[PDB]
């Protein structure tokens, strides 16, 4: 299937009591794998298959790198506040990563946000930064001036990030590449008088990616379907649902290459 690796950074200026100035967290798919923050000042694993397969050298080296990157975020955030003429507490975020698609193709992304809004989006195909406003444009020009760093970034998204992802994917295969099929049921109920509600409910499945829909007479898809979020159940699996309100209805579910139909 499609897997992904990504590293987030959150910087907060003038934080209240109890909020780190800086937090950085890594994920493989939906699973946290690493954590660092300005309070512990240490990078630690957040999955046991990460802890077991990476020697102390790794955590030691990246602890030093993250301290440096923490300092880098702090100063960048100061400059952005200056550009906007902002005071008080603001936030600064970035997301870097890559995906290895099921058909073997790849993607790579690198994005920044100021106060929770898109700010700069890197296009690794033209080696350029997309800016949302004039302040981002100011930063863009600075970053686009350094040709070699743009080349380094493209190489990191396309080659390094993908090789890290394959490495981590192997380490955690018993978790990441397993399949737990959905338990799926349909519930019927007359609600408001005259109104009958159909709910198609799935739970216990992994990976979280699941497709659910309602069909009428096997052909057309029903209009006005309500969708429920894919929610973590807390035991490593997920749950979700889809619902609608004198012909024949059926719920269709696809999960990890297996298709399921529940007729009413």
């Amino acid at each position, epitope marked *: 299937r499609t897997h992904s690796l990504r590293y987030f950074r959150l910087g907060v200026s003038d934080p209240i009591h109890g909020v780190p100035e800086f937090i950085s967290v890594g994920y493989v798919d939906s699973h946290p794998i690493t954590t660092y923050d300005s309070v512990t000042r240490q990078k630690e694993p957040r999955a046991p298959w990460m802890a077991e397969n990476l020697a102390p050298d790794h955590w030691e080296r990246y602890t030093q790198l993250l301290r*440096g990157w923490q300092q880098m975020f702090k100063v960048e955030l100061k400059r952005l506040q200056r550009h906007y003429n902002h005071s008080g507490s603001h936030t600064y975020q970035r997301m870097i990563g890559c995906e290895l698609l099921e058909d073997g193709s790849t993607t790579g992304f690198l994005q920044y946000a100021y106060d929770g809004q898109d700010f700069l989006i890197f296009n690794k195909d033209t080696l350029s930064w997309l800016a949302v406003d004039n302040v981002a444009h100011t930063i863009k020009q600075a970053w686009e001036a350094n040709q070699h760093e743009l080349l380094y970034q493209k190489n990191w998204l396309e080659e390094e990030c993908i090789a890290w992802l394959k490495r981590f994917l192997e380490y955690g295969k018993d978790t990441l590449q397993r399949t737990e099929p959905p338990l799926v049921r349909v519930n019927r109920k007359e609600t408001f008088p005259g109104v009958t509600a159909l709910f198609c409910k799935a739970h216990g499945f992994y990976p979280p990616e699941i497709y659910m829909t309602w069909m009428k007479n096997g052909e057309e898809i029903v209009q006005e379907i309500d969708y429920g979020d894919i929610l973590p159940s807390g035991d490593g699996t997920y749950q979700a649902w889809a619902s609608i309100e004198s012909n024949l209805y059926s719920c269709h579910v696809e999960h990890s290459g297996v298709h399921m139909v529940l007729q009413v």
Partner: antibody
Amino acid sequence: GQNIDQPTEMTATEGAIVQINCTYQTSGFNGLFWYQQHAGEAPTFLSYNVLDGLEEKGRFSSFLSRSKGYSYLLLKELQMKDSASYLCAVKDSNYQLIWGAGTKLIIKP
Amino acid sequence: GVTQTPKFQVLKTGQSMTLQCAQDMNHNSMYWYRQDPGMGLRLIYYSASEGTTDKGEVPNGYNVSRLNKREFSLRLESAAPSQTSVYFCASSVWTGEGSGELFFGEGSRLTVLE
């Protein structure tokens, strides 16, 4: 990573061409640098390659092949003043610099 | 760019010694290297930014102080003959960026004698 190899010494003739090879076998790759170091002097940055291709900077060019894992530093129209050691170094996947033992270039007038 | 001292120093075995390095380029990262005939540069200690330092490849016999953003001093607590070498301080804008190059100091020639 683990190792970087470049020849110990090369000798060419003034006015001609010399190519200095650097191969690397590293745990990941975040770019290859060349440095120039005159005898008794500090090393100074010459070039950086991280994608495939050839980058020219005056009489010097530097090439990288990612798939064959090697670089060369190309010096055209050699001058006596080009006599120096040339240092190859790769950044590995953890951004640690791994250094070649350097190539001493000797120019024959 | 990078100023380091002293250019030359003779030490008796067991003596203390501090090498100073300063950079006014507002760089965040600094390094101490030794250079010995027949091998590549070897990292002794480094400082990725102000307020953190760590061992490099050959930290034994040495320690360092990242005094402030500008200054990274190298200390030989008890000089030994094998520490006879050429020492280079270097800095870079950051660490963890692929293309950032090093800027080297002029070197310190250290000779440790019994």
